[PDB]
Amino acid sequence: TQVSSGQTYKITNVKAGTVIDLSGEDNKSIIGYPYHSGKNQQWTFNWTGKAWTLRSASSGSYLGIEGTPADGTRLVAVNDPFEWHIWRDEANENAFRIFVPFTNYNLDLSGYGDTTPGTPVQLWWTWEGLHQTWTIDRP
Numbered sequence: 210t211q212v213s214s215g216q217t218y219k220i221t222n223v224k225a226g227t228v229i230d231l232s233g234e235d236n237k238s239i240i241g242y243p244y245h246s247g248k249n250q251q252w253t254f255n256w257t258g259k260a261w262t263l264r265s266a267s268s269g270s271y272l273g274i275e276g277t278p279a280d281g282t283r284l285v286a287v288n289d290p291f292e293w294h295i296w297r298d299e300a301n302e303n304a305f306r307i308f309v310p311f312t313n314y315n316l317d318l319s320g321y322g323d324t325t326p327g328t329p330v331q332l333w334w335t336w337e338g339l340h341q342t343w344t345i346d347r348p
């Protein structure tokens with residue numbers, strides 16, 4: 210399936226198999242969680258003209274970040290559209306990396322893709338670890 214502006218997707222960690230999930234505990238924290246077709250596990254993509262924004266299908270908040278980009282920066286739901294660069298992974302072209310634009314920081318399921326439900330999604334410097342790679346497909 211092709212990723213296209215206006216469409217809504219789930220985003221699955223290649224290492225863990227859990228998906229990017231807007232925590233039901235606080236409707237703010239971004240975690241890895243097993244997929245149950247929740248709307249808090251579905252993200253509406255928009256191409257702005259220069260980057261992607263990801264809108265929570267349940268809350269209407271956007272996938273964004275907790276502070277300035279760094280190793281360990283938490284992802285959180287934010288009010289305003291937050292722009293991402295999204296590229297195919299170089300080794301596995303069916304998967305993707307999601308970067309803060311013009312940085313080397315990409316989404317990373319913490320604990321090296323810890324499968325535990327509630328594992329935070331964070332930024333980390335880009336490297337080959339598969340917990341930084343994600344499939345994007347229909348809910």
Ligand SMILES: CO[C@@H]1O[C@H](CO)[C@@H](O[C@@H]2O[C@H](CO)[C@H](O)[C@H](O)[C@H]2O)[C@H](O)[C@H]1NC(C)=O
Binds near residue numbers: 233234235250
């Ligand atoms: C009423 O308590 C909340 O119930 C929700 C439904 O079971 C639950 O939502 C899930 O949260 C997890 C993360 O903890 C994940 O986001 C799932 O996709 C959600 O369905 C809340 O966690 C419950 N707890 C609290 C404290 O609200």
